[PDB]
Amino acid sequence: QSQLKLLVTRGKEQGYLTYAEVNDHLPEDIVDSDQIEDIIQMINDMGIQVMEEAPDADDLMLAENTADEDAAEAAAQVLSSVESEIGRTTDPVRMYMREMGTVELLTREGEIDIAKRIEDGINQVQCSVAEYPEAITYLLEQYDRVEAEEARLSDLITGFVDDPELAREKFAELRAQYVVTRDTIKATAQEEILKLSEVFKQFRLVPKQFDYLVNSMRVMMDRVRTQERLIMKLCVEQCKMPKKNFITLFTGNETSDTWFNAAIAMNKPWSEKLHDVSEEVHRALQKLQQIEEETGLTIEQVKDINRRMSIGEAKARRAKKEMVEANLRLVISIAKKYTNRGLQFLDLIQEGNIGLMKAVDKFEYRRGYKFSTYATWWIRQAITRSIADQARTIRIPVHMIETINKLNRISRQMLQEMGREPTPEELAERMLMPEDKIRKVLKIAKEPISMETPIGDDEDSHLGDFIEDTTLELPLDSATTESLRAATHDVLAGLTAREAKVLRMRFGIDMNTDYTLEEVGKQFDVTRERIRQIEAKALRKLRHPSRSEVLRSFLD
Amino acid sequence: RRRKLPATIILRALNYTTEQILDLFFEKVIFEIRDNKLQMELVPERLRGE
Ligand SMILES: C[C@H](CCC(=O)NCCC[N+](C)(C)C[C@H](O)CS(=O)(=O)O)[C@H]1CC[C@H]2[C@@H]3[C@H](O)C[C@@H]4C[C@H](O)CC[C@]4(C)[C@H]3C[C@H](O)[C@]12C
Numbered sequence: 375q376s377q378l379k380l381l382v383t384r385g386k387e388q389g390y391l392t393y394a395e396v397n398d399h400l401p402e403d404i405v406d407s408d409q410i411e412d413i414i415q416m417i418n419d420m421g422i423q424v425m426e427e428a429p430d431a432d433d434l435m436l437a438e439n440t441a442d443e444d445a446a447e448a449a450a451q452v453l454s455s456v457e458s459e460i461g462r463t464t465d466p467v468r469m470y471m472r473e474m475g476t477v478e479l480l481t482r483e484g485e486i487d488i489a490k491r492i493e494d495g496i497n498q499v500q501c502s503v504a505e506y507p508e509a510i511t512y513l514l515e516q517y518d519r520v521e522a523e524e525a526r527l528s529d530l531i532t533g534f535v536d537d538p539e540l541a542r543e544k545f546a547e548l549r550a551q552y553v554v555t556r557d558t559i560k561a562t563a564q565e566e567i568l569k570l571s572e573v574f575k576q577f578r579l580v581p582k583q584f585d586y587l588v589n590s591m592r593v594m595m596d597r598v599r600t601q602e603r604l605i606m607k608l609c610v611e612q613c614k615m616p617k618k619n620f621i622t623l624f625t626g627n628e629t630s631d632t633w634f635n636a637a638i639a640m641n642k643p644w645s646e647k648l649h650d651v652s653e654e655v656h657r658a659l660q661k662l663q664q665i666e667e668e669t670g671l672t673i674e675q676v677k678d679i680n681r682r683m684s685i686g687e688a689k690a691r692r693a694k695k696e697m698v699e700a701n702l703r704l705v706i707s708i709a710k711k712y713t714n715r716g717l718q719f720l721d722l723i724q725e726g727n728i729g730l731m732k733a734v735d736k737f738e739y740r741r742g743y744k745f746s747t748y749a750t751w752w753i754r755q756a757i758t759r760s761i762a763d764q765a766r767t768i769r770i771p772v773h774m775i776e777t778i779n780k781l782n783r784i785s786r787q788m789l790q791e792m793g794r795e796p797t798p799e800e801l802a803e804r805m806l807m808p809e810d811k812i813r814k815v816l817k818i819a820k821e822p823i824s825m826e827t828p829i830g831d832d833e834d835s836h837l838g839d840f841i842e843d844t845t846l847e848l849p850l851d852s853a854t855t856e857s858l859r860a861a862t863h864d865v866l867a868g869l870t871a872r873e874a875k876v877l878r879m880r881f882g883i884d885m886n887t888d889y890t891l892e893e894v895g896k897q898f899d900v901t902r903e904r905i906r907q908i909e910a911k912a913l914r915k916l917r918h919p920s921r922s923e924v925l926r927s928f929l930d
Numbered sequence: 931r932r933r934k935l936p937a938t939i940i941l942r943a944l945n946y947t948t949e950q951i952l953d954l955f956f957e958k959v960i961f962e963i964r965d966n967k968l969q970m971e972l973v974p975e976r977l978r979g980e
């Protein structure tokens with residue numbers, strides 16, 4: 375028993391179901407605007423569609439009752455749905471509204487907290503980069519590029535932290551310290567590398583360079599990790615390497631042969647097959663050793679560096695996450711203004727979200743100002759740019775849109791300070807434009823009208839049914855062309871052999887591309903003035919009527 | 931065009947006593963108990979149809 379079991383019966387027991395019923399018999403929930411739509415459509419597959427206030431006549435409701443099929447899952451669907459009162463929030467607006475509703479407002483001091491964590495993550499990863507002798511090589515390579523004049527002074531740095539003169543001298547002393555600490559490699563070298571890294575902390579690289587350096591170190595670590603994974607894969611899977619002893623002997627170094635030669639000494643039969651692919655495996659171990667020879671430090675500090683970079687990145691990512699979910703409400707608040715420029719609401723809020731992400735990433739708390747005011751600028755800029763760009767069907771550059779808007783504002787102003795209206799000349803008056811381009815921009819403003827717009831109802835006529843295609847040449851003209859070809863073929867047949875070939879070849883009559891004088895002469899092997907003269911003599915002699923009368927009348 | 935409510939609530943939500951409602955909507959027949967017997971004040975018109 376429910377509040378619909380008594381309805382579904384009526385529906386087919388009394389033929390129909392008036393609106394009043396399906397209105398009051400609903401539970402309490404999913405009353406949402408037109409949530410009924412789905413239950414009415416299900417009830418419609420049984421035969422109802424009652425009119426305004428339940429009329430009757432009309433013995434015809436069973437053809438449409440049969441025209442809605444046996445398969446009645448719907449019945450089950452409705453039952454389940456209306457027997458659970460899970461909010462059937464179909465409209466994405468509501469669900470997103472709740473999703474944002476979950477994250478409470480991250481107050482001011484929380485925001486400065488997360489800003490400190492972001493800064494700390496970035497600084498952590500920057501220190502981590504400092505710590506392997508293949509990152510300063512490329513630094514100096516592109517610094518020389520910039521100084522040697524193979525690059526530009528603004529393509530590598532955007533101001534240090536505690537003038538080009540100062541940068542040049544610091545890189546001189548960097549070169550000196552670097553070379554001395556590389557020579558001194560043979561304990562002491564680790565301390566001197568630490569001191570070089572501590573001086574290198576001074577540098578700030580252009581964002582693109584920071585991305586490229588993290589990417590170069592990422593791809594070298596990719597080579598390391600892929601080589602290690604493939605070596606341990608080939609070993610454990612082809613040599614049947616017990617994975618606990620794998621851990622014990624292989625783990626720690628992954629670079630020396632001690633576990634290699636202990637496993638081959640282990641006397642296992644797969645240990646003997648180990649030579650079958652010893653060349654490959656040991657070549658991969660050697661390549662890894664060379665990679666660490668250009669690393670140079672060890673095989674544990676690679677682990678340390680990758681884990682610290684991941685940790686820092688994760689921290690920063692999480693902080694930015696916090697900020698964005700806290701300011702989503704701000705984004706939507708700013709969105710409400712632009713809703714009615716022929717774009718959907720949710721697209722706007724998404725553009726605002728992108729602007730908020732950028733703002734968050736570029737925000738500086740040390741300036742001492744509140745975050746919301748700063749983010750507003752990027753959210754509004756992004757929203758405006760997206761509405762401008764994705765709005766019109768025939769996309770229009772943003773400056774032209776701004777000019778159209780300005781024109782509109784001026785038009786309205788003058789229309790209401792003038793009474794009648796502004797003529798295009800008067801608009802040109804208020805603008806410095808040459809008055810010529812005013813009408814041009816006025817033309818540009820027209821928003822294509824919908825092809826399906828209903829015409830004055832002679833019912834079931836739309837607009838598309840009128841527009842005719844001028845492309846189609848009339849069948850008359852095709853008959854004309856056929857007659858033309860026939861008459862030209864007969865008059866050519868009247869001509870001599872070589873005159874015929876001259877006229878056919880100079881043009882395309884009965885052949886593909888038409889050959890010019892020199893190529894036709896080549897095909898005759900006589901290429902000279904005589905061939906054009908033959909063309910001209912044929913033309914002149916065909917001027918005479920009786921040969922021309924057929925085409926003389928054929929002119930149009 | 932909402933759900934269907936019962937309707938004396940309206941007629942009572944203006945702060946209306948049940949007794950006053952009965953006095954508004956129905957004439958009254960008053961009986962007297964005395965001598966352990968019962969009598970009714972008869973208006974013959976009202977008997978039509980019984
Ligand atoms: C939306 C509008 C519907 C008009 C309509 O439905 N009239 C119904 C008129 C009915 N009456 C008054 C004639 C009476 C009936 O005949 C008798 S009864 O009242 O219905 O009983 C559509 C249908 C034809 C469209 C015009 C054409 O594209 C040409 C032109 C293109 C320009 O770029 C923009 C302007 C123009 C004028 C368009 C405007 C607009 O886009 C129109 C009027």
Ligand SMILES: C[C@H](CCC(=O)NCCC[N+](C)(C)C[C@H](O)CS(=O)(=O)O)[C@H]1CC[C@H]2[C@@H]3[C@H](O)C[C@@H]4C[C@H](O)CC[C@]4(C)[C@H]3C[C@H](O)[C@]12C
Pocket residue numbers: 829830837840841842
């Ligand atoms: C909107 C308009 C309806 C006019 C109408 O309904 N008049 C009703 C006139 C009624 N009266 C004045 C004659 C009195 C009658 O006695 C009343 S009654 O009709 O008898 O009820 C229809 C009729 C002619 C149609 C245009 C032509 O195709 C040319 C052109 C083709 C393009 O591809 C699209 C644009 C153009 C401009 C078309 C648009 C549109 O499609 C028009 C204007």
